């Protein structure tokens with residue numbers, strides 16, 4: 001009833017426009033054989049409704065994972081994706097989305113000895129997609145804990161504001177490690193959503209209906 | 218004051234033009250401003266570690282020390298390794314202090 | 315509220331020729347759109363107060379939980395290590411370049427509008 | 439002594455014509471949902487048709503759609519109500535979408551009630567006030583009745599015909615049963631030859647019949663071949679079925 | 684009546700006072716893209732206001 | 735350290751609740767607002783040539 005008024009050309013609207021169009025360009029549509037006109041328009045609309053919304057899902061996962069990754073770089077906060085269940089559940093749910101899409105394409109029917117190892121390489125990416133994010137968010141924070149525990153002992157044992165350069169040379173290293181944490185917090189969201197587009201767009205291929213009759217020449 | 222506006226204008230002044238890169242001189246010793254903020258960062262970290270160590274100093278460290286001692290303690294619960302021994306040593310040290 | 319061009323048409327048609335050019339700024343200002351003026355502030359609304367109180371409550375509760383965590387001084391110094399990079403990002407990021415670079419991500423703001431080229435829609 | 443009171447109150451408090459006294463304050467909602475519950479009951483829809491008359495002309499588009507498809511599904515035709523519904527559509531034609539106008543035109547094609555103003559305003563709404571792929575989202579069993587409703591009244595609107603002919607394809611005809619697909623191909627080809635309008639997307643309606651001729655009579659296949667020859671001459675080419683490969 | 688006509692046209696779109704009346708018919712063509720680009724950029728950029 | 739959570743299903747359900755809310759908020763509040771201002775500009779920039787030719791042909795004032 002009473003929704004808020006939005007300025008046109010806001011910075012979040014521009015940013016989310018660029019983000020959504022980026023993730024929508026990962027699984028582009030297929031250019032048909034016939035030229036696109038009013039004859040081919042229901043076939044194009046129908047192909048656009050038999051394609052999964054991987055653009056919307058991928059920017060959903062990109063936005064939630066980059067916000068949970070950048071929570072771990074604000075003070076007094078831990079990343080939610082440094083939990084095993086959170087990050088690994090996002091990974092298993094992307095893999096289950098790709099599998100449910102691929103199962104509903106054929107029949108909801110589950111598919112030599114070369115193919116079960118292809119299956120245990122396909123069922124591993126449920127584990128891999130989640131725990132890459134989880135171990136990347138956990139390992140930098142763990143190294144940060146350890147190396148600032150080693151960086152606190154030398155101003156503990158020596159004087160405060162005395163013998164400065166041995167603490168300066170480890171505080172520069174801690175600063176570089178939190179900068180690497182920012183880079184990893186952006187790149188792992190990017191890698192997760194690129195891989196979600198890849199895994200779901202493996203099964204995002206249907207039959208273009210097209211014209212079954214024509215008036216040629 | 219207005220509790221929305223005065224500190225807003227004060228922080229606008231402090232952020233934008235109350236710069237201690239020139240009001241404390243500091244061009245004569247540093248090369249750029251990208252080197253000043255890179256050193257202001259590590260200076261902020263060193264000030265933070267010194268302030269948070271000094272604000273509660275007589276404590277047994279949770280972090281693994283390298284077998285060193287802060288000041289004239291050297292055998293105290295500040296320098297102990299097993300935590301129950303330092304726990305009871307602090308329990309006897311606290312009644313005297 | 316009828317449309318302002320019919321207001322211009324009506325307000326021009328019922329004016330005598332002796333007082334047409336005097337009355338033209340009145341019809342120009344009667345049909346200029348409303349840009350509402352800057353009302354009095356009364357700042358920090360109820361949702362902004364909920365946001366700032368919840369943020370301070372969260373920071374206090376997380377700092378109570380960090381300080382009793384068996385690795386507690388390491389957590390209190392990790393807050394310093396993170397706030398240092400917040401301070402560093404608010405000092406070397408070019409914010410006008412970031413504004414005009416996010417503005418170029420959207421095709422709506424990367425260029426101006428394009429229709430209605432002023433020769434097709436004249437009424438002579 | 440419970441069964442006596444239950445048996446006397448099972449048709450004293452609960453009866454199929456005391457619900458219609460609570461169902462009069464919001465009549466399009468209750469009309470639509472009791473029509474979807476099968477409660478057709480023309481002796482209660484006489485009550486409904488006069489219970490809504492003083493407030494039809496200030497209704498929403500969804501309320502008018504609910505009313506109109508309910509009175510289609512109860513097979514009741516009060517023309518004094520349908521002039522008010524036609525006034526509501528013609529006074530707010532910019533606010534109706536094609537999913538509502540197709541249901542309203544299917545109701546008015548059941549009960550043959552039209553005007554030139556209503557036909558022009560519905561054609562203006564479907565062509566210009568709605569999205570140009572809203573016929574694609576429609577399903578041909580209602581676009582066929584829209585073409586029939588326009589060919590019955592002889593209202594030639596080539597803009598509406600070009601818009602409605604987008605909604606005929608292999609996709610929108612393959613979602614029909616073969617009896618209903620025969621119905622919509624016949625009514626669409628008849629209403630396309632009535633106006634003399636042969637768009638490029640008539641070849642989908644023709645090829646819906648030519649790939650399966652086992653459903654039609656010799657007269658119906660003559661009616662398909664007549665429009666096939668007319669559309670071959672109009673579109674400037676020769677018809678050809680396309681095979682996969 | 685002529686002054687009222689041009690008064691309405693210059694109250695709605697005041698940029699029209701930069702193509703002179705004698706020079707207007709020399710700009711047209713049979714297609715819209717064939718219109719001479721002498722005043723196209725100027726009428727486009729004057730119409731966007733005084734800023 | 736903290737490697738397994740106290741309940742794995744609670745954390746997976748928190749992930750599902752957060753990502754489902756981000757999907758709803760995207761699809762409902764952001765993507766209409768994205769698409770209104772994107773497609774006003776897009777329909778104008780794609781329509782401009784044919785719109786101006788149609789409006790040139792439709793007005794009699796030349």
Ligand SMILES: [Zn+2]
Nearest residue numbers: 141145389392
């Ligand atoms: Zn931590």
